[PDB]
Amino acid sequence: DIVLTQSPASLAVSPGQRATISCKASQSLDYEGDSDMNWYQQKPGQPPRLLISGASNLESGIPARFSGSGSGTDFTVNIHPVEEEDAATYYCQQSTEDPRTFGGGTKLEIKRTVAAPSVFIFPPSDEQLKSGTASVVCLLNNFYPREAKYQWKVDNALQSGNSQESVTEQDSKDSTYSLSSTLTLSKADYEKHKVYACEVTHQGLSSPVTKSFNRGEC
Amino acid sequence: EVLLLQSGPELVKPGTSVKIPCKASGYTFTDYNVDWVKQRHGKGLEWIGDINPNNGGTIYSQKFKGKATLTVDKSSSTAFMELRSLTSEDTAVYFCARNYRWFGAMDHWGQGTSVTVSSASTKGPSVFPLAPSSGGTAALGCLVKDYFPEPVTVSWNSGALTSGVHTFPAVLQSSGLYSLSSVVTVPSSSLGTQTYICNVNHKPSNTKVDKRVEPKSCD
């Protein structure tokens, strides 16, 4: 089997700059004038899209910002300039021999400017409390970079181990992320306390932003 | 032009088999081979096999011998893949792709069939409102909680509201049920002029829930 070593596993490139992704094969992909190296672009939720075949044949419909090159065992795809719609995972694949093999993939993160999140907190609904469970949700909206430090506070006491988070894929338009954290407590534990807060520390914030509500109010 | 149509997401039980279709159109079906590619959640692509519709000749990856079976129906221009003795290791998205038998790249792909292998029962979701309390921009949403299997679709105002919508990836709770939130940011002044309704559709259980998110005026 022809093993394809794709590097780097991930990289962050600002718009306008150059992204360079490499693919090294365990043996030559040349065969009677051909270099059967194929590059694909896969955006989240979508199937892969063929960018380049024959190592350097830019497919019809793909912008000229993409270019492939190389021969034998060393190949390269370049994105110049990188655009914000280029946020995806890119794979190399050889069609020289069977079995067909893919590279490990390279996740391209669009490095935009710093963006502080807009923070929102949501109390559990009266309808859910009837089931004996309380879900408190905190929203961190449209921020960059992805590294966001947040913490739940119940009566000013830091929480841990009782929340789950979910993060959206990088937005194709503004290159930001959004994060939702759900704090799960029993109804009895929820009634035992008053102040529920979500505290966010981010690179774009001058001071940590805290959103909170009092259980009884509103 | 060239279209490869696969079936939608499917929940299957372990110890059973499943047959995934890939209906082709927009080109000469017998002129191209059909390959199948497996992708686990958050992972890469791994090649399953290859079939020539002209004669039915198949080439399998060694890793899938005895697990995957590739067939074609020339008259209906459809390729099939059957997975046997299903386990949780088979839970993945399976793509079909068009390629030339002679060193051809995979230039057109199906949209992928998301197969979930689990013995858990189908469960419809509960929809709870994420209501804001009265800045300049407000956020509201819906908590779609305790359902199985994936996926659920969430639209806002029957699809009329799309800007600012963030529907997060589902998370698997310790109970074994999924849960996700869908939020949208709107002008605060619109909380009194616009009605905001989240439309949740859970096709595996034929559940359609519409939930109005009523804000709370709080001095």
Put simply, the answer to whether B169 touches A38 (Cβ < 8 Å) is no
- Cβ-based contacts of A122 with chain B (< 8 Å): 130-132, 141
| B126-212 carries CATH number 2.30.30.230 | no
B133 interfaces chain A, CB cutoff of 8 Å: yes
The partner residue sitting opposite A102, judged by closest CB among B45, B130, B166, is B45
CA distance B153 to chain A (A): 13
DSSP A123-176: PPPHHHHTTTEEEEEEEEEEEBSS--EEEEEETTEE--SSEEEEEPPPPTTT--
Question: What span, in angstroms and rounded, lies between the C-alpha atoms of B175 and A200?
Answer: 28
Note if the bond before B151 is cis, omega within 30 degrees: yes
B3-117 matches B126-212 in fold: yes
Enumerate residues 104 to 123 of chain B having a beta carbon within 8 A of any beta carbon in chain A.
104-112
DSSP run (H or E) holding B167 = strand B165-167
Enumerate residues 7 to 36 of chain B having a beta carbon within 8 A of any beta carbon in chain A.
35
Instruction: Give me the phi and psi of B124, to 5 degrees please.
Output: -75, 155
- 8-state DSSP, B144: E
**B148 close to B176: Cβ distance less than 8 angstroms:** yes
Give the residue from B159, B148, B157, B145 showing the smallest Cα distance to B213.
B157
Strand ranges (DSSP E) for B3-151?
Answer: 3-6, 10-12, 18-25, 33-39, 46-51, 58-60, 68-73, 78-83, 92-99, 106-109, 113-117, 126-130, 137-147
B184 interfaces chain A, CB cutoff of 8 Å: no
Torsion over CA of B150, B112, B166 and A160, rounded to 10 degrees? 50
Chain A interface, mutation test: which of B106, B113, B126, most A Cβ atoms within 10 Å? B106
Instruction: Name the closest residue on chain B to residue A44, using Cα atoms.
Output: B42
Instruction: Name the closest residue on chain B to residue A178, using Cα atoms.
Output: B166
- The tokens describing B45, both together, are 């692509």
| B3-117 carries CATH number 2.60.40.10 | yes
CB-based burial label for A63 (10 Å; 0-12, 13-18, 19+): exposed
CATH fold of A4-110, please? Immunoglobulin-like (2.60.40)
Put simply, the answer to whether A99 touches B129 (Cβ < 8 Å) is no
Question: What span, in angstroms and rounded, lies between the C-alpha atoms of B38 and B46?
Answer: 5
B46 interfaces chain A, CB cutoff of 8 Å: yes
- The tokens describing A21, both together, are 């992704």
Instruction: Name the closest residue on chain B to residue A46, using Cα atoms.
Output: B111
The partner residue sitting opposite A96, judged by closest CB among B62, B103, B216, is B103
Q: Residues with Cβ < 8 Å from B6, sequence gap 6 or more? A: B20, B21, B22, B23, B94, B95, B96, B110, B111, B112, B113
- 8-state DSSP, A187: H
The residue extents of the domains of chain B are 3-117, 126-212
The CATH superfamily assigned to A118-214 is Immunoglobulins (2.60.40.10)
| B207-212 vs B197-202, strand pairing mode | antiparallel
DSSP run (H or E) holding A190 = helix A187-191
The residue extents of the domains of chain A are 4-110, 118-214
Give the residue from A178, A181, A180 showing the smallest Cα distance to A141.
A178
A4-110 matches A118-214 in fold: yes
